[PDB]
């Protein structure tokens, strides 16, 4: 059920976040935005947790973007992985963060906090994302400036993607947000959207249910707050996988 | 001079050939087709050898395609590398296998035997290769059918390259050759070209110095034989790096 894959590269962003890549089974297929069970072998039972696949389905490796919880059963150990180590990966990806469950639209907003950024790494590398949308707004809301992950990638490297680059300079807009200190965009994503600061910064029109589509991935609080905002502006959720709406959303984690 | 990189993936083709990938230094730049010194740390002095870079310069990792010599000082050890191991990689790539040293042409023939295939893995992934040529003929001459490396990649996977695929189906022609047993294309590359079997199979015209360009990488014998053939047909070699000709060539190894 859970075959081992091998850890390739590992990068630590902060004391709380790190990324890693693994090998990918020949028969492993997924839709961009989906999550899969991953984990570790132990002295007893394997430790297994849901993780977004932070890479596109056309890519040769898998990537994961992970929290580090000091006493978390999985991540207390996962944080110490090294190239060559084994990480268990499931066979059955699933999840709600699918552009196929978004009604036709013009602007695609990817609203993520913390590790909620993970599925966006997949989505922004899907060619179909750009076939369907005029603008793709990539966000990450974090606490401090130093917490922003993949910043150089988004700001410098991705606009040079030998293959996606030309399109990305035209369509991909990066909007980092920081809560706990002064910054160009200071606040929760809900607050930056509530008074239209996000749209003003990006040069986009006031939110409109006919035009704007959302994918939302974050804390229980951010999901509740953003859903309340969008619902109050006339946006309708996708009610289940396979049924389209103006937005889709998925818990980045649960407060256990 | 020789910083360590980390081994990522390893694949054994036969008892005599294997491939591996490594991390790449942020400041490491190269022209497609070039070689670099690589090697291993030891109990004394590092073991260092010239290796073609078997990947394109736009890619995030390096790949190498290696012989296994039973009592070879480097490869007796290199064959046992595992994910996570360190491989030394030089800073100063060089070499003659540069499309920039080919006069304008129509068809690009990549004539390789054994590990001579390595630089072609770089060249066939360079977008500039296809800007400059109507057809790219990818060869590997080997002894037995089972020795052909990357066969599924060339025949099945590469024509589906999410980004290079459309172009490759149009322009990339794979021509495997085998000497020691019956096969669609049986013989040395020199022999398959001497009587035009290669051109007939591929549906290309008789060799013509105005139109056909060659990059040649292989054994001392194959280089001598192919140069004699091409020279007798009026093709002129590039005399040095930076001065263009109808063909370029480089030793895949030396008989020590
Ligand atoms: C659909 C889904 C997708 C998920 N995708 C990811 C992902 O891409 N990356 C990832 O790191 N985790 C993801 N998670 C959370 C993940 O399943 C684990 O909870 C996480 O690996 C921590 O495991 P643990 O055993 O160390 O801590 P656990 O005992 O699961 O969690 C303990 C506490 O850690 C905190 N926590 C757990 N995960 C996070 C998190 N991601 N961000 C902030 N705080 C967290 C919460 O306070 C939680 O109560 C996802 C969860 C679900 C349900
Ligand atoms: C410009 C250049 C590029 C090279 N690129 C590559 C490359 O991409 N991949 C690679 O494996 N080697 C390549 N080589 C050969 C390489 O430098 C080493 O010789 C090889 O790694 C074997 O090292 P060793 O110490 O094990 O054997 P060494 O003592 O170097 O060689 C001993 C014997 O092994 C045989 N041999 C060595 N290399 C090969 C080979 N590649 N194919 C068939 N027989 C060989 C010869 O009989 C040689 O006399 C290249 C050499 C040069 C000069
Ligand atoms: Cl929020
Ligand atoms: Cl030959």
Which H/E stretch holds residue A225? helix A220-232
List the 172-231 stretch of A: residues with Cβ below 8 A of B. none
Residues on chain B touching A80 (C-beta within 8 angstroms)? none
Neighbours of B50 (CB within 10 A): 16
DSSP A82-126: -TT-EEEE-S--B-S--GGGB-S-SEEEEEEBGGGGHHHHHHTT-
**Rounded-to-10 torsion of CA A242, A243, A249, A255:** -70
Instruction: Please answer whether residues A176 and A146 qualify as being in contact, where contact means their C-beta atoms are separated by less than 8 angstroms.
Output: no
Q: Sheet of A3-12: strands edge to edge? A: A47-52, A35-40, A86-89, A3-12, A17-22, A62-67
The fold for domain A1-94 equals Elongation Factor Tu (Ef-tu); domain 3 (2.40.30)
- Measured between CB atoms, does A83 come within 8 Å of chain B? yes
- Domain extent listing, chain A: 1-94, 95-256
Determine the Cα angle at A41 with ends A20 and A252, to 5°.
50
Q: Name the residue among B154, B152, B160, B100 with its Cα closest to residue B131.
A: B100
Residue found under tokens 């002894």: B143
Contact B83/A83, CB-based, under 8 Å? Answer: yes
Contact A8/B83, CB-based, under 8 Å? Answer: yes
What residues contact residue A60 under an 8 Å CB cut-off, 6+ apart? A24
- Measured between CB atoms, does A163 come within 8 Å of chain B? yes
Cα(B37)–Cα(B43) distance, rounded to whole angstroms?
19
Query: Does ligand 1 lie within 6 Å of residue A256's CB atom?
Result: yes
Our measurement of the distance from residue B56's CA atom to the centroid of its chain's CA atoms, rounded to an integer in Å, reads: 11
- Measured between CB atoms, does B160 come within 8 Å of chain A? no
What residues contact residue A183 under an 8 Å CB cut-off, 6+ apart? A145, A176, A177
Give the up-direction half-sphere exposure of residue A100: CA atoms within 13 A in the CB hemisphere: 11
Instruction: For domain B95-256, say whether CATH 3.20.20.240 is its number.
Output: no
Determine the Cα angle at B117 with ends B123 and B154, to 5°.
75
Closest Cβ–Cβ partner in B23, B58, B82 for A9: B23
Residues on chain B touching A127 (C-beta within 8 angstroms)? 162
Q: How far is the CA of B30 from the centre of ligand 2 (A)?
A: 21
Integer CA distances (angstroms), B3 to A249, B7, B35, in order? 45, 13, 16
Q: Could you tell me the two tokens for B208?
A: 């013509």
List the 90-149 stretch of B: residues with Cβ below 8 A of A. 127
Cα(A142)–Cα(A188) distance, rounded to whole angstroms?
8
Our measurement of the distance from residue B220's CA atom to the centroid of its chain's CA atoms, rounded to an integer in Å, reads: 15
- Measured between CB atoms, does B82 come within 8 Å of chain A? yes
**Ligand found nearest the CA of A111:** 3
Q: How far is the CA of B252 from the centre of ligand 2 (A)?
A: 7
- Measured between CB atoms, does A71 come within 8 Å of chain B? no
- DSSP code for B248: E
Closest Cβ–Cβ partner in B6, B7, B163 for A163: B163
Method underlying the structure: X-ray
Residue found under tokens 């400036």: A145
Determine the Cα angle at A221 with ends A217 and A225, to 5°.
85
């Amino acid at each position: 059920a859970f075959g081992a894959e091998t850890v390739l590269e590992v990068r630590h962003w902060t004391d709380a976040y790190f990324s890693f890549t693994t090998t990918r089974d020949a028969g492993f297929r997924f839709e961009n935005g989906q999550f899969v069970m991953i984990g570790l072998e132990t002295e007893t039972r394997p430790l297994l947790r849901a993780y977004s696949i932070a890479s596109a389905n056309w890519e040769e490796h898998l990537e994961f973007f992970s929290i580090k919880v000091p006493d978390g059963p999985l991540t207390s150990r996962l944080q110490h992985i090294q190239p060559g180590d084994k990480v268990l990966v499931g066979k059955k990806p699933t999840g709600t963060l699918l552009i196929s469950d978004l009604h036709p639209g013009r602007n695609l907003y990817l609203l993520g906090t913390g590790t909620g950024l993970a599925p966006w790494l997949s989505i922004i590398k899907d060619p179909e994302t750009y076939e369907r949308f005029d603008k793709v707004i990539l966000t990450q809301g974090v606490r401090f400036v130093q917490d922003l992950a993949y910043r150089d990638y988004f700001e410098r490297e991705l606009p040079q993607h030998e293959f996606l680059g030309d399109l990305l300079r035209e369509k991909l807009l990066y909007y980092p947000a920081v809560t706990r200190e002064t910054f160009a965009n200071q606040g929760r994503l809900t607050e930056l959207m509530a008074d239209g600061r996000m749209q003003q910064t990006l040069g986009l029109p006031t939110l409109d249910p006919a035009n704007d589509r959302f994918m939302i991935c974050g804390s229980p609080q951010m999901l509740a707050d953003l859903r309340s905002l969008l619902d109050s502006r006339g946006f309708q959720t996708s009610p289940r996988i396979g049924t389209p709406g103006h937005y889709v959303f998925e818990r980045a984690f649960v407060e256990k």
